Amino acid sequence: AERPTLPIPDLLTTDARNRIQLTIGAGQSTFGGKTATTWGYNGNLLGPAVKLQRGKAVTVDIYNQLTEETTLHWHGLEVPGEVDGGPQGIIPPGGKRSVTLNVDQPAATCWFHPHQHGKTGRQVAMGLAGLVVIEDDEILKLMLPKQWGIDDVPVIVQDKKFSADGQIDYQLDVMTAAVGWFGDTLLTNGAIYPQHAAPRGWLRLRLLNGCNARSLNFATSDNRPLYVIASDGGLLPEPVKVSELPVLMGERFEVLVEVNDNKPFDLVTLPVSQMGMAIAPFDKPHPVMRIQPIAISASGALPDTLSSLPALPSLEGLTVRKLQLSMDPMLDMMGMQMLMEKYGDQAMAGMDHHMNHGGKFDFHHANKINGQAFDMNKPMFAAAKGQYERWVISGVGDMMLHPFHIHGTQFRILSENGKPPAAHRAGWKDTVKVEGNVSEVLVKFNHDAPKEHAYMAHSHLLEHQDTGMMLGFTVG
């Protein structure tokens, strides 16, 4: 059989009432010929791409048609806590919540997903994620590839695992609370190994790692380069040529890749050095999608300069906040031993060379920041508004991967896990790697967040977030 075409999320803009309608619901999808119950926004799986313009407000009406509570967070969008959709932003089953978003940041590819307390990993795994395309006046002047679904395409890459009956097999248990939920099946906008027909010239891919716990590393099957033009929070100052592109959970990058007649190639993900993630079929480069060249000229450009990136300021006198991540040693060892028992030595490939004792030992609050598992009732601190701060995030104490995300901001990385950031990671970011070492980021919050609707800061390894590796903080 030929490959299926890459599904393209609809690009949604406002109605005359200036509203966008999102319905959250359950439906059915098919994977490898077997039906599965899945959840989607405005459909059975995944979601549309909401298009937003800097300096314009839009109202979003969000209808929860699930039979359980959910929330909707705009990952990467800088909005007041009241509309951020963290775990306090409950939408009752059968209810509706509306938010007005006043977009106040540069062009970027952001995304949106649930943030239900303790259940974010399951609700993402069941299918909920969508995209956000922010435009501004500056980016349109660059004449980048811009035909949605033709030469400008979103690529949401996610793994799943399924039980023998075809259903999604999600469990938050000691092993996945330790290593994360991951699977053996890779989806690209919900489809298994699709093809995308692209015109000759430049193809723009808006890459999102939407996996719960798996890190990815994109490359091409014939080693043509990727030109990074944008990170989580928008354009880089100039393109950065790379041969491979590591992407942590929740991160976005936009790249341009050349398309030449008669020479199809795959986008692939290369094996990563993360516990559990190099079990077959991920022990080898894994195709993500086939790019099928079409002998029609693509009009987009790769300009020499993309945007202005301001200088880091002086760090002297800035507030320094320390965030110590931690895992329970006993439960980390128990979860890792179950992984090893299940899959054997392959569960550590690529890495560097039973009774009930009560609630004190419960893995649901095993992961912590500054000695506390997430307490929705107690923001850990009150950050300054409109002031730069230096947040220092330490993973010393364990060797698991912690992609650390801070709501409410796009920051600058000063140190990523003990090294200055790579050039394509030196612009606007909302995620920073922490693994065995220490990161430092320069953040500023332009909007208020009160105790009742606090901003979150957390690991975006969802099973760790859900089992306590998150804090709340207020601004203003």
144/249 with CB nearer ligand [O]: 249
State in angstroms the smallest separation of the CB of 52 from Cu ion: 15
Residue 246 interface partner, choices ligand [O], Cu ion, none, CB cut-off 5-8 Å depending on type: none
Q: Would you call 284 exposed, middle or buried from its count of C-beta atoms within 10 A (0-12, 13-18, 19+)?
A: exposed
Of 75 and 444, the one with the shorter C-beta distance to Cu ion is 75
Minimum CB–partner distance for residue 114 and ligand [O] (Å):
9
Give 128 or 256: the residue with its C-beta nearer to ligand [O].
Answer: 128
Q: How far is the CB of 447 from Cu ion (least distance, A)?
A: 13
Q: How far is the CB of 284 from Cu ion (least distance, A)?
A: 29
Residues of this chain that bind ligand [O] (CB under 6 A): 73, 75, 115, 405, 407, 460
Cβ proximity of 365 and 468 under 8 Å: yes
CB nearer to Cu ion: give 14 or 123: 123
In 3-81, alpha helices (H): none
Judge contact between 411 and 78, C-beta under 8 A. no
- Residue (115 or 368) nearer to ligand [O], CB: 115
d(CA 371, CA 340): 28
3-state DSSP helix/strand/coil % of the chain, to nearest 5: 10, 40, 45
Centre a 10 Å sphere on the Cβ of residue 337 and count the other Cβ atoms it contains: 13
Q: Which does 444 bind (CB under 5 to 8 A by kind): Cu ion, ligand [O], none?
A: none
The answer to whether 252 touches 232, Cβ cutoff 8 Å, is yes
Ramachandran assignment for 100, one of left (phi > 0), alpha (psi -120 to 50 degrees), beta (any other): beta
Residue type present at position 85? G
Say how far apart CA 351 and CA 353 lie, in whole Å: 6
Closest separation between CB of residue 321 and Cu ion, Å?
Answer: 18
- 204 interface partner picked from ligand [O], Cu ion, none, CB below 5 to 8 A per type: none
- Measured from each CB, the residue nearest to ligand [O] is 75
CB 107 within 8 A of CB 53: no
Q: Which is nearer to ligand [O], 86 or 145 (CB)?
A: 86
Q: Looking up tokens 């994620």, which residue turns up?
A: 129
Please count the CA atoms within 13 angstroms of the CA of 304 that sit on its side-chain side.
0
Quick one: 115 or 444, whose CB is closer to ligand [O]?
115
Question: What is the closest distance, in whole angstroms, from the C-beta atom of residue 233 to ligand [O] in the complex?
Answer: 13
Name the residue among 438, 447, 428, 463 with its Cα closest to residue 136: 428
Tokens 């050095």 identify what position? Answer: 273
Interface residues with Cu ion (CB under 5 A) are 75, 250, 407
When the beta carbons of 334 and 406 are compared against ligand [O], the nearer one is: 406
Q: How far is the CB of 391 from Cu ion (least distance, A)?
A: 15
Q: How many CB atoms lie within 10 A of CB 438?
A: 16
Q: Which residue matches tokens 């392959």?
A: 346
Binds 196: which of ligand [O], Cu ion, none (CB < 5-8 Å by kind)? none
Question: Of 204 and 453, which CB lies nearer to ligand [O] in the complex structure?
Answer: 453
Cα distance between residue 160 and residue 171, in whole Å: 12
Secondary structure of residue 139 in the 3-state scheme: helix
Q: How far is the CB of 219 from ligand [O] (least distance, A)?
A: 26
Q: How far is the CB of 85 from Cu ion (least distance, A)?
A: 9
Tokens of 56: 């314009």
